[PDB]
Write a protein of this length. Structure first.
Lengths: 147, 147, 147
């Protein structure tokens, strides 16, 4: 059925997204360390790496919404509505993380540490919120895949 | 011992950024056409391309600020400060365009056309604002390179 | 083919190599954290990422040796000779780090903590040796571009 072709594609997207999230976590931790140590040039490199991975998470989150919107169109009922709603909230949170990371990158480039720290700390908190939604989405999809 | 290399890197970054801006414009035009013609799958492809190019413009704009900030440290004069201020305003505008494109991409994925159209038109306007600052920056750098 | 173009290539290679070394350091830190926290799948991913960056460092080291030998032919200079000797010692050291990282990868795959711990500790010690050599190389290249 198209429904399980879509669920299959969704599992592949989310597996790829998880790998990217692990890379984003590494880059985020490295940026925090460079920031603590006053290594400004190293921090710039780690922030650019984080922004690259965050852009990739954003793309995967968009693809996840598009796939669940497609799944809902093949369903005659609201079985996939909950998963789509989670995925849409995930995407909203991921894009907020992206915007706030951008504010941090610009503040670091502008040499405005107070703005940098505020935005970077928001980015970290949004990432934790996104992680909660990501795991919720995985659980919801497992219940749609049956076997 | 450094400013000439900084200036040459800046010229290379801005040349690469302009090509990316042209590619972004082509993707934007193609997305507008797909939207008007109701071809949602085509629109998704063109929006993903636009988002990729926009992320690259964002990166080049960050690099531009960092290079001009370095130049201002080496040669702390009014020319350098003016160039950096223009580049910082360019980066601000580029990142506003990036966040607005994110809203549009999410709306298209969510099937929310009212939000998509409003955000997409805001994105176009911010792009034109960024173009003005980009050309202003080029004129200032001409005065800084002195041939 | 001219002395100045070869130096320009060397400067670019070492710039790129330092960014790759930063990525290797972030992946290594993330692997250490996953190892300490007992997250074996995360550890496996970060070891694979570290090995990828280590292999890229190895290739930049190869290219640096080749380029310095080319520079000695067209612009003899006791300092290019010094740089080549450092770069060759660096190449040997980064290859040894790659070997020990490979041993760590295999030990994680086999679930052999005793072998893993020894190999990972050796990898760290060799990375610090390579870091010292890389700093010496950067200093020598700075002198080659003219003190
Ligand atoms: C906790 C952490 C994080 N987990 C995420 C899960 C899904 C999305 C994002 C995101 N930023 O878009 C996440 N960010 C580790 C990487 C930085 N923060
Ligand atoms: C007019 C146009 C545009 N010109 C820009 C110049 C600098 C930056 C951006 C940006 N979006 O960051 C620009 N966007 C063409 C490409 C789509 N909109
Ligand atoms: C400090 C660290 C390290 N610094 C290096 C500098 C040049 C080469 C290498 C290498 N392994 O080839 C380096 N490794 C980061 C990861 C653990 N060791």
């Amino acid at each position: 059925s198209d429904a399980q072709e879509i669920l299959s594609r969704l599992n592949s997207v989310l597996e790829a997204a998880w790998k990217t999230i692990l890379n984003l976590a590494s880059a985020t931790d490295a940026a925090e360390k460079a920031y603590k140590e006053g290594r400004e040039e190293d921090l710039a490199t780690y922030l650019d790496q984080a922004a690259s991975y965050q852009s990739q998470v954003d793309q995967y989150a968009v693809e996840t919404v598009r796939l669940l919107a497609e799944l809902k169109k093949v369903f005659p009922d609201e079985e996939a509505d909950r998963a789509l709603q989670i995925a849409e909230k995930l995407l909203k949170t991921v894009q907020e993380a992206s915007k706030t990371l951008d504010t941090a990158v610009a503040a670091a480039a502008n040499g405005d540490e107070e703005t940098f720290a505020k935005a970077f700390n928001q980015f970290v908190s949004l990432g934790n919120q996104a992680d909660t939604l990501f795991t919720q989405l995985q659980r919801t999809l497992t219940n749609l895949n049956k076997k």
